[PDB]
Write a protein that holds these residues in place. Structure first.
Motif, PDB file in Angstrom:
ATOM      1  N   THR A 135       1.176  78.954  71.625  1.00  0.00           N
ATOM      2  CA  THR A 135       1.496  80.093  70.788  1.00  0.00           C
ATOM      3  C   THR A 135       1.399  79.672  69.345  1.00  0.00           C
ATOM      4  O   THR A 135       0.912  80.426  68.500  1.00  0.00           O
ATOM      5  CB  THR A 135       2.889  80.629  71.024  1.00  0.00           C
ATOM      6  N   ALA A 136       1.869  78.441  69.037  1.00  0.00           N
ATOM      7  CA  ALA A 136       1.850  77.934  67.681  1.00  0.00           C
ATOM      8  C   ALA A 136       0.429  77.872  67.169  1.00  0.00           C
ATOM      9  O   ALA A 136       0.168  78.185  66.012  1.00  0.00           O
ATOM     10  CB  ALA A 136       2.450  76.517  67.573  1.00  0.00           C
ATOM     11  N   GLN A 137      -0.521  77.444  68.025  1.00  0.00           N
ATOM     12  CA  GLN A 137      -1.902  77.342  67.614  1.00  0.00           C
ATOM     13  C   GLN A 137      -2.459  78.713  67.320  1.00  0.00           C
ATOM     14  O   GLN A 137      -3.244  78.883  66.390  1.00  0.00           O
ATOM     15  CB  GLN A 137      -2.777  76.694  68.693  1.00  0.00           C
ATOM     16  N   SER A 138      -2.087  79.725  68.131  1.00  0.00           N
ATOM     17  CA  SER A 138      -2.603  81.063  67.924  1.00  0.00           C
ATOM     18  C   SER A 138      -2.128  81.606  66.598  1.00  0.00           C
ATOM     19  O   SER A 138      -2.900  82.221  65.867  1.00  0.00           O
ATOM     20  CB  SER A 138      -2.170  82.060  69.021  1.00  0.00           C
ATOM     21  N   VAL A 139      -0.830  81.409  66.266  1.00  0.00           N
ATOM     22  CA  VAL A 139      -0.304  81.954  65.032  1.00  0.00           C
ATOM     23  C   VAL A 139      -0.754  81.138  63.840  1.00  0.00           C
ATOM     24  O   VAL A 139      -1.028  81.703  62.779  1.00  0.00           O
ATOM     25  CB  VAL A 139       1.209  82.067  65.017  1.00  0.00           C
ATOM     26  N   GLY A 140      -0.851  79.792  63.967  1.00  0.00           N
ATOM     27  CA  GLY A 140      -1.257  78.986  62.834  1.00  0.00           C
ATOM     28  C   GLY A 140      -2.442  78.166  63.229  1.00  0.00           C
ATOM     29  O   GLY A 140      -2.403  77.418  64.203  1.00  0.00           O
ATOM     30  N   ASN A 142      -3.548  75.743  61.534  1.00  0.00           N
ATOM     31  CA  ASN A 142      -3.341  74.361  61.176  1.00  0.00           C
ATOM     32  C   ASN A 142      -1.870  74.174  60.944  1.00  0.00           C
ATOM     33  O   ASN A 142      -1.441  73.851  59.839  1.00  0.00           O
ATOM     34  CB  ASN A 142      -4.102  73.967  59.890  1.00  0.00           C
ATOM     35  N   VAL A 143      -1.057  74.382  62.003  1.00  0.00           N
ATOM     36  CA  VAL A 143       0.374  74.237  61.869  1.00  0.00           C
ATOM     37  C   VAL A 143       0.715  72.787  61.648  1.00  0.00           C
ATOM     38  O   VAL A 143       1.465  72.454  60.733  1.00  0.00           O
ATOM     39  CB  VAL A 143       1.126  74.710  63.088  1.00  0.00           C
ATOM     40  N   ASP A 144       0.156  71.882  62.481  1.00  0.00           N
ATOM     41  CA  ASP A 144       0.465  70.482  62.330  1.00  0.00           C
ATOM     42  C   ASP A 144      -0.403  69.716  63.286  1.00  0.00           C
ATOM     43  O   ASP A 144      -1.099  68.782  62.894  1.00  0.00           O
ATOM     44  CB  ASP A 144       1.948  70.151  62.636  1.00  0.00           C
ATOM     45  N   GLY A 145      -0.364  70.092  64.584  1.00  0.00           N
ATOM     46  CA  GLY A 145      -1.162  69.401  65.561  1.00  0.00           C
ATOM     47  C   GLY A 145      -1.544  70.386  66.616  1.00  0.00           C
ATOM     48  O   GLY A 145      -0.745  70.726  67.483  1.00  0.00           O
ATOM     49  N   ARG A 146      -2.804  70.856  66.563  1.00  0.00           N
ATOM     50  CA  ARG A 146      -3.289  71.808  67.530  1.00  0.00           C
ATOM     51  C   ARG A 146      -3.968  71.050  68.642  1.00  0.00           C
ATOM     52  O   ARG A 146      -5.108  71.332  69.008  1.00  0.00           O
ATOM     53  CB  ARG A 146      -4.283  72.825  66.916  1.00  0.00           C
ATOM     54  N   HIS A 147      -3.253  70.065  69.231  1.00  0.00           N
ATOM     55  CA  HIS A 147      -3.823  69.273  70.296  1.00  0.00           C
ATOM     56  C   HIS A 147      -2.859  69.284  71.455  1.00  0.00           C
ATOM     57  O   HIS A 147      -2.029  68.383  71.600  1.00  0.00           O
ATOM     58  CB  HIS A 147      -4.063  67.809  69.889  1.00  0.00           C
ATOM     59  N   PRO A 148      -2.964  70.294  72.301  1.00  0.00           N
ATOM     60  CA  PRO A 148      -2.078  70.427  73.454  1.00  0.00           C
ATOM     61  C   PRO A 148      -2.230  69.328  74.464  1.00  0.00           C
ATOM     62  O   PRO A 148      -1.249  68.899  75.070  1.00  0.00           O
ATOM     63  CB  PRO A 148      -2.461  71.777  74.077  1.00  0.00           C
ATOM     64  N   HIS A 149      -3.475  68.840  74.655  1.00  0.00           N
ATOM     65  CA  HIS A 149      -3.734  67.784  75.609  1.00  0.00           C
ATOM     66  C   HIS A 149      -2.998  66.540  75.184  1.00  0.00           C
ATOM     67  O   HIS A 149      -2.344  65.884  75.992  1.00  0.00           O
ATOM     68  CB  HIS A 149      -5.238  67.450  75.724  1.00  0.00           C
ATOM     69  N   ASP A 150      -3.098  66.185  73.886  1.00  0.00           N
ATOM     70  CA  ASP A 150      -2.450  64.991  73.392  1.00  0.00           C
ATOM     71  C   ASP A 150      -0.952  65.175  73.406  1.00  0.00           C
ATOM     72  O   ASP A 150      -0.215  64.243  73.715  1.00  0.00           O
ATOM     73  CB  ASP A 150      -2.873  64.636  71.951  1.00  0.00           C
ATOM     74  N   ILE A 151      -0.470  66.387  73.056  1.00  0.00           N
ATOM     75  CA  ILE A 151       0.956  66.639  73.007  1.00  0.00           C
ATOM     76  C   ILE A 151       1.572  66.488  74.369  1.00  0.00           C
ATOM     77  O   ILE A 151       2.555  65.773  74.520  1.00  0.00           O
ATOM     78  CB  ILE A 151       1.258  68.014  72.465  1.00  0.00           C
ATOM     79  N   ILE A 152       1.007  67.139  75.408  1.00  0.00           N
ATOM     80  CA  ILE A 152       1.585  67.026  76.730  1.00  0.00           C
ATOM     81  C   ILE A 152       1.404  65.625  77.234  1.00  0.00           C
ATOM     82  O   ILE A 152       2.245  65.113  77.969  1.00  0.00           O
ATOM     83  CB  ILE A 152       0.995  67.989  77.727  1.00  0.00           C
ATOM     84  N   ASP A 153       0.295  64.966  76.847  1.00  0.00           N
ATOM     85  CA  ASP A 153       0.068  63.609  77.284  1.00  0.00           C
ATOM     86  C   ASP A 153       1.154  62.731  76.708  1.00  0.00           C
ATOM     87  O   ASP A 153       1.727  61.902  77.409  1.00  0.00           O
ATOM     88  CB  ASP A 153      -1.299  63.052  76.835  1.00  0.00           C
ATOM     89  N   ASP A 154       1.451  62.898  75.397  1.00  0.00           N
ATOM     90  CA  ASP A 154       2.464  62.093  74.755  1.00  0.00           C
ATOM     91  C   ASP A 154       3.822  62.456  75.303  1.00  0.00           C
ATOM     92  O   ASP A 154       4.651  61.577  75.549  1.00  0.00           O
ATOM     93  CB  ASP A 154       2.502  62.291  73.224  1.00  0.00           C
ATOM     94  N   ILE A 155       4.084  63.774  75.512  1.00  0.00           N
ATOM     95  CA  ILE A 155       5.377  64.197  76.027  1.00  0.00           C
ATOM     96  C   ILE A 155       5.598  63.581  77.375  1.00  0.00           C
ATOM     97  O   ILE A 155       6.628  62.935  77.598  1.00  0.00           O
ATOM     98  CB  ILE A 155       5.490  65.694  76.188  1.00  0.00           C
ATOM     99  N   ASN A 156       4.602  63.728  78.287  1.00  0.00           N
ATOM    100  CA  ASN A 156       4.729  63.187  79.625  1.00  0.00           C
ATOM    101  C   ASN A 156       4.831  61.687  79.570  1.00  0.00           C
ATOM    102  O   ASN A 156       5.538  61.083  80.376  1.00  0.00           O
ATOM    103  CB  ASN A 156       3.545  63.531  80.546  1.00  0.00           C
ATOM    104  N   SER A 157       4.098  61.043  78.630  1.00  0.00           N
ATOM    105  CA  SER A 157       4.126  59.598  78.532  1.00  0.00           C
ATOM    106  C   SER A 157       5.539  59.158  78.261  1.00  0.00           C
ATOM    107  O   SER A 157       6.002  58.175  78.836  1.00  0.00           O
ATOM    108  CB  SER A 157       3.226  59.039  77.406  1.00  0.00           C
ATOM    109  N   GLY A 158       6.255  59.865  77.362  1.00  0.00           N
ATOM    110  CA  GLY A 158       7.621  59.484  77.086  1.00  0.00           C
ATOM    111  C   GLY A 158       7.939  59.848  75.675  1.00  0.00           C
ATOM    112  O   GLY A 158       8.313  58.993  74.875  1.00  0.00           O
ATOM    113  N   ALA A 159       7.791  61.147  75.323  1.00  0.00           N
ATOM    114  CA  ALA A 159       8.089  61.572  73.969  1.00  0.00           C
ATOM    115  C   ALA A 159       9.568  61.483  73.718  1.00  0.00           C
ATOM    116  O   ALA A 159       9.998  61.097  72.633  1.00  0.00           O
ATOM    117  CB  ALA A 159       7.680  63.025  73.670  1.00  0.00           C
ATOM    118  N   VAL A 160      10.383  61.843  74.731  1.00  0.00           N
ATOM    119  CA  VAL A 160      11.807  61.857  74.559  1.00  0.00           C
ATOM    120  C   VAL A 160      12.421  60.900  75.550  1.00  0.00           C
ATOM    121  O   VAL A 160      11.973  60.788  76.691  1.00  0.00           O
ATOM    122  CB  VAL A 160      12.350  63.251  74.760  1.00  0.00           C
ATOM    123  N   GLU A 161      13.474  60.164  75.098  1.00  0.00           N
ATOM    124  CA  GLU A 161      14.142  59.204  75.947  1.00  0.00           C
ATOM    125  C   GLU A 161      15.552  59.697  76.169  1.00  0.00           C
ATOM    126  O   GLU A 161      15.759  60.828  76.605  1.00  0.00           O
ATOM    127  CB  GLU A 161      14.204  57.787  75.323  1.00  0.00           C
TER     128      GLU A 161
END
Length: 165
Positions: A135-140, A142-161
């Motif tokens: 949704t963020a990508q649709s509204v902006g 260039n909000v900050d990071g329009r890379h869902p693949h990398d975001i979920i990859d990083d999140i799943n990798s261990g974004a939060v502990e």
């Protein structure tokens, strides 16, 4: 320690006109116009001050303060001139990328997910992160990071502990 004095709002205008005539001069037009001063007062003051029928290559100077004009007549011509080179401060105007909201970061999604608040908790962590980020990508664009693949990859990798951030 050093002594000082409070400044006053004093304006100086140069008037080059002789004879009986009322009105505003060249400097008064652009000064008084936006100032909101009444030209009639200035013209009347000038006419009364120079009601002695002065007209022999003379320069007249007037001081403006609180819509009050003081007329001073000096002999000869070639009056001195000085420029302050300073202007009053003001707030600037610029465009912002905030728009509707902006500042969309996966951290926010993680924060609500961990807090279990009804903001971006949704159901699945991957589904909500992808959905909100998408949704963020649709509204902006260039909000900050329009890379869902990398975001979920990083999140799943261990974004939060242990902490949400």
């Amino acid at each position: 320690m050093p002594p000082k004095f409070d400044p006053n709002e004093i304006k100086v205008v140069y008037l080059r006109c002789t004879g009986g005539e009322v009105g505003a001069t060249s400097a008064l037009a652009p000064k008084i116009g936006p100032l909101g001063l009444s030209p009639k007062k200035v013209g009347d003051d000038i006419a009364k001050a120079t009601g002695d029928w002065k007209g022999l290559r003379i320069t007249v100077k007037l001081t403006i303060q609180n819509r009050q004009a003081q007329i001073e007549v000096v002999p000869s011509a070639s009056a001195l001139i000085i420029k302050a080179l300073k202007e009053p401060p003001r707030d600037r105007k610029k465009q912002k990328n905030i728009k509707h909201s902006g500042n969309i970061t996966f951290d926010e999604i993680v924060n609500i997910a961990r807090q279990m608040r009804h903001r971006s908790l949704a159901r699945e962590l991957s589904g909500t992160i992808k959905e909100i980020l998408g949704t963020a990508q649709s509204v902006g664009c260039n909000v900050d990071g329009r890379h869902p693949h990398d975001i979920i990859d990083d999140i799943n990798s261990g974004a939060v502990e242990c902490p949400a951030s």
